[PDB]
Amino acid sequence: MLKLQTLQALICIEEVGSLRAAAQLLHLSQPALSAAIQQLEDELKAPLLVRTKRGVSLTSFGQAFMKHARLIVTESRRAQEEIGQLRGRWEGHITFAASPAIALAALPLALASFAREFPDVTVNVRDGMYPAVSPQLRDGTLDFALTAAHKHDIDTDLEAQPLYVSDVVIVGQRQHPMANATRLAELQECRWAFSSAPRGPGAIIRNAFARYGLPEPKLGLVCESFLALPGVVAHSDLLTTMPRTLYERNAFKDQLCSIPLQDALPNPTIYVLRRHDLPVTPAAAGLIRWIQHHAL
Amino acid sequence: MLKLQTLQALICIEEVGSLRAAAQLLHLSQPALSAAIQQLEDELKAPLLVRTKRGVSLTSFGQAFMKHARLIVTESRRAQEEIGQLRGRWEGHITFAASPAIALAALPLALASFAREFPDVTVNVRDGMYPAVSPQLRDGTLDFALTAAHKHDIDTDLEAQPLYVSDVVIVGQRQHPMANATRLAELQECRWAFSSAPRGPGAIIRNAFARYGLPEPKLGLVCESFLALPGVVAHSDLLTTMPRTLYERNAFKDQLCSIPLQDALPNPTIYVLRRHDLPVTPAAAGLIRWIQHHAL
Amino acid sequence: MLKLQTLQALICIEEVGSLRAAAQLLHLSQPALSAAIQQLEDELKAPLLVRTKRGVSLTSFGQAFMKHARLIVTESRRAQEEIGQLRGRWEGHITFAASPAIALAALPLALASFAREFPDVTVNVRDGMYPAVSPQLRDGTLDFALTAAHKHDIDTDLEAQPLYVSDVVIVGQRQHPMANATRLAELQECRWAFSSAPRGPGAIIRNAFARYGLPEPKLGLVCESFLALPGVVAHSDLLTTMPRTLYERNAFKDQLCSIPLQDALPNPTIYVLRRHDLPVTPAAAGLIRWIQHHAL
Amino acid sequence: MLKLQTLQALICIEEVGSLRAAAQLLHLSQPALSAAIQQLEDELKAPLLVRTKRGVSLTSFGQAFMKHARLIVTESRRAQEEIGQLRGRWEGHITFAASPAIALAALPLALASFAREFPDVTVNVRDGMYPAVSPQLRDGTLDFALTAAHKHDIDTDLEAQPLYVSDVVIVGQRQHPMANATRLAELQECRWAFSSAPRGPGAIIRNAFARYGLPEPKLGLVCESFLALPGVVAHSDLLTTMPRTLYERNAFKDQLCSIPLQDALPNPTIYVLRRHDLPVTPAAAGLIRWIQHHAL
Ligand SMILES: [Cl-]
Ligand SMILES: [Cl-]
Numbered sequence A, B, C, D: 001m002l003k004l005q006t007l008q009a010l011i012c013i014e015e016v017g018s019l020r021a022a023a024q025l026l027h028l029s030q031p032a033l034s035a036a037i038q039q040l041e042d043e044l045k046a047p048l049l050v051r052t053k054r055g056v057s058l059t060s061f062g063q064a065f066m067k068h069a070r071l072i073v074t075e076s077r078r079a080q081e082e083i084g085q086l087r088g089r090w091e092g093h094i095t096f097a098a099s100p101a102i103a104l105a106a107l108p109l110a111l112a113s114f115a116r117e118f119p120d121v122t123v124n125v126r127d128g129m130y131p132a133v134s135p136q137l138r139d140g141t142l143d144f145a146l147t148a149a150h151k152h153d154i155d156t157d158l159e160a161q162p163l164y165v166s167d168v169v170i171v172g173q174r175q176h177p178m179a180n181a182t183r184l185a186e187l188q189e190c191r192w193a194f195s196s197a198p199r200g201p202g203a204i205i206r207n208a209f210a211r212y213g214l215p216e217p218k219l220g221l222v223c224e225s226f227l228a229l230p231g232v233v234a235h236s237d238l239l240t241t242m243p244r245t246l247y248e249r250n251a252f253k254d255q256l257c258s259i260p261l262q263d264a265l266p267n268p269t270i271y272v273l274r275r276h277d278l279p280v281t282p283a284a285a286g287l288i289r290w291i292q293h294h295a296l
C-alpha cells in the first residue's frame, strides 16, 4: 505494498537512516519494503534514496518528493480522524419512537440487554405513532419508529419490518354493566373513549362496528394519551380499546375489566419503520435485535 | 378577500396531503376544490401548494399562511360554539393537553365531573408539555395546556394560571445499590434516565446536582415518554426523577422504590396555559373549573 | 356576502351606531349587508344587534361574538400583510445564469426593456453552463439558466424551453496558416484551445473530429473562460471553437479570423432551464419574454 | 488503510453521479468498482455513498472525505510531475484562475511565452475570484489564483504574492446624462450595475460612495459576469466600475465612455494566491514567472 505504508516508511527512513531499521520499527517485511520503494522509484523515474556507509539518505529527488509524502500521510491521518469523529457521533446516538405495547413489555428488558452490549451509546426514546412519525422519519430527526401500521398504507419512502402481532382489548371499569357481553352489537349504544390508532382516533372501534354491520359508535370523548386512558376509563362508564399489554400493565388494574367478546377484533401488526435509503448504525441494528428478542 | 370555506379546505388538504383525498372528505369534485384553491392563490398572487410525488405540499407561502388559516377557522368555530353555550345549548369541542401528575390523578375525576354537567360537549385530551405546546395554543388548535412551566420564562402573549404544586422524587428499582441512600451526593456516580421537563430532558436532576455542588449527572439514556419510564427504571439500574403522582401510579410499583433522600428536591408548579387574547369559551372555562377542583 | 366583509361591517356598526351608515362608509349595499347579518344571526341562533332610537347596538351575544370578530379581522389582515411581505421579496428579485451568446447580444437589449417594465425588480446575472448550473437550479439558488444543452441529456427535474439556435465557429489569429482551409481534416494536426461546452472542455471539436472520421484533436490548452479566449487565441497559433456571437463581439476582432469550412459544425440549442416543480414569478416570466424577443 | 486507486475512483464517481457511469470511464466492471468502494467504506466503518434516483450521491461522511481525497490524489500527481520536471521531462498539468485585468492583457502574452518554453505542459485556465477560489486552492484542484484581494483579509493558510496594481474607472454609455461629470457626488442619483469584487458585488462603488460622504449607491442590477458587463452598460443608462483594462478591451468600446472624474478611485492589488504549505511545481513556478513578466 500500500502506497501509504511505503510513504510512512520513507518518512521513517529519513528519520532513522536505514530502510531495514525502518521496516523493523514499522513491522514491515524488509524485502517487501525494499521492493515497494524500488517500484515507486521506477514509476517516478528517479531514485529516492542513496546508500551511505551509515545506511541511506534521501536524494535531491527524495527531498522534493518527501514534502508531498508528508502532506499525503498527514492528510490521510486527518481524513481518518475526521471520519472517526463524525462516525463516533453517528454511532454514539440513537433516537426512536415506540408504541405502548412495545414501551411496556419489550423495551425495558431490551434496553437493559442493549446497554450491556453497547455501553457507550446514548439512546433517546419517545412515544410515537404512524403516520405522525412519518415526516420525522423522512427528515431524519427520528432514526426508526416501532409502531402499528397497515402494510398497504405505509409511505413508499419507508422500510417496514414486522416486530410483534398485538392484541386489541375492549376495556371498561370493573363493574361496567356490559362486562359480561358476548357480542359487539351488545355494546352498540355504549359511549366510547376514542383511543389513538394509525387511521385516527377511535379508528379501531369504528372499523369494527362497521364490519359487524353496526352504526357509528357513540363518541364519549377522544383520549389520545395512552398514559391517561386507563384511569379516565376506570373513573367513568366509557368503554375503550387498548393494546392488551396496556391492559395488563397500568396503574388502575384493580379497577378495570376487559370484556372478552366472542366477536373477534383485529390484531394490529407492530412494525419497525424507517427510511429505506438511510444507512443504519450497528447500535441501532443491535437495539432492534434486542427489541425483537423480547417481542415474542 | 379570503373565503372561510376555502381556508377550511386548505387545512383539510394539508391534513391528508392530496387534492383527490381532500376532495373526497369535503364531498366535492376534484376540479371544484382546485377552483377554490386557485381562487385563493390567484388573489394572494402567491402559490400555496406544490405538486409532489406523494400529492401536494405547502409552499413557503402556504406554510406561513397556515398558522393564520387555523386561527381564523378555529376562532370562527369557537365564536359559534360560545353563542350556542350562551343560549344554553352546551355543545362544542374542547381540545387540551395534560402533564403526567394531572393526567393520573386530577383528570379522571375532573373529566367524569365535567361530563355529568356538560354531557354534549366533545372533549379531546392529549399529552403535552411547555414549550412544545406553544404553537398550538397560538394557532387555536389547542384550547389550553396543563403543564409545568417557570413563571418568569413564559412568553408574553400567554397567560398562566397556577393549578398544582407537584412533588419530585428520585426513583430506582427496588433492590437498587443506592436504594438506602439519604444524600444526593451518594448518587453522583449513578446513571440516570433523563425524563422530560420544560427546560429539556433531565433538567430537574441536572439543576439539582448543580445547586448541591455536584458535577453533571451521568446520562444513562433520555426517555421522553412518561408511559415508558417506570418500566425502564424497574428493569435496570437507572435512576430517574418523576412526579410523586407517577411514582404512586404506575404498572411497576412492586419493582420500584423511592430513594429516601434528606436533601430537598424542587416542587414544579403546574399551570393552565392559554393564548391570552383568545376569549375562553364557557364550556372550556367549565372544564378548567373541574380540573382546578380536583387538583387540590 | 363574504364573511370577512360582514365582520368588518359589524365592527364599523359598533363604532358608528348604524347598519346603514356602516354600509355607506364601507361602500356596501345596505339591503345586502342587512341580509348578510340576518343570515349570520340565523346561523348563530342569536341576534347580534338590537335597535335603538339612535340606530343599533350590539346585544350580549354580539359583544361576545365581537371579541372573536376582531381577532378574525385582524388575523386576515396579518395574513395578507405577511403574504405581501413574502411575495414582495420573491417577486422583487431574479437570479439567473446566461451563456456568452445570450450575454452578448440578447441580454443587454432585453435587460433595458425589462427594467422599463419592471422598474422595482433586482436582477442578479452570472455566467453559467450546463450541467454545472444543475445543482444550483435544483437547490433553488438559481431561478433559471440560459445555456446550451442536449435535449436528451437534461435532468428529469428540469424543464427546458428552446431560446436560440446558435452557431459554432472555428477561430484563429488573423494570419493563421490554415485560415483558408475548406475541410476539417485539414486542421487535424493543429493545436486547440479547448473551450467550454455541456459535455466538457473541447467536446464540440472532439465530437466533430470523431464524426468526420479523424483522430482526437491535439490539445494545446484548456481555456474555460470565454472572456479570456479571444485574446489567448489572438496571441497564439491555437485554433478554438466559439459561439458566432462571441466571434462578432470581442475585444480582439481586428486580430482574429473565422475559418469558414465547407464541413458543417453543430448548431447548439440554447435553452431556458429550470426546475419544473418550482413556481415562476411574473417578473422572471417577463424577463424571459424579453430575452426571447431579442433572441431572433 | 486507504488505497490511492480507490480515492481516484471515488472522485470519478462524484464527477459523474453513477456507479455504472464511473465504471465505464475507469475501464472496470460495475461490481469491481463496488468491491473497491465497499472496501473503503467497510474499513472506514462509514457509508460514503447513497443510492439515489439519479444514481449515487455522497453521504455526509462522503462529502467530508472528498476534500481530503482530492488533496491526496492531486498531491500524489504533483509529486510525480515534479520529479519528472526535475529530470527535464517538462510534462504535467497546471490549473489556475484569473481575474479580468490579467486575463485580457497579461495572460495572452504570458501563455504564449510559457508555451514556447514548456510546450508539453497542459494548462487549464478559468475565471475566478477570491474568496470563491479558496476551497479549490485548499483541496489542490486549483494550483493558484490571480485575483484581487485585501492583504489583511486573506486566510492564514494562504500565501499572497503581489502581481499587479489595477486602476478602477467608472463607465457609462457614450451619451450618458452624466458623461461629462467630474465629481462622484454628481452621480449620487444614478443607477449602478454592481460588478464583482472580493468583498462582494458593488463593494468598490459602495465603499467609494461611503468614503466620499455619500449615501448608498442606488442598485440597478447585479452583474457578476465581466463578460456581460460592458454590453449591459452600453445599452442602458447604468453606470458601473470596471478595471481600466476591461474599459479599454471590450466589444462595446465605441458605445461607452469613462466618466472624467477628478475624485480619486481605488487601485485594487491583484495577487498570486496559493495554499502556502503545498510545494509549487517547477512548471507552475515557470508559468507564474511569465505572468509576472507580462504584468508590468
Ligand atoms: Cl388503525
Ligand atoms: Cl424544568
Ligand SMILES: [Cl-]
Binding pocket: C197, C198, C199, C200, C203, C204
Ligand atoms: Cl457539448
Ligand SMILES: [Cl-]
Binding pocket: D197, D198, D199, D200, D203, D204
Ligand atoms: Cl473589494
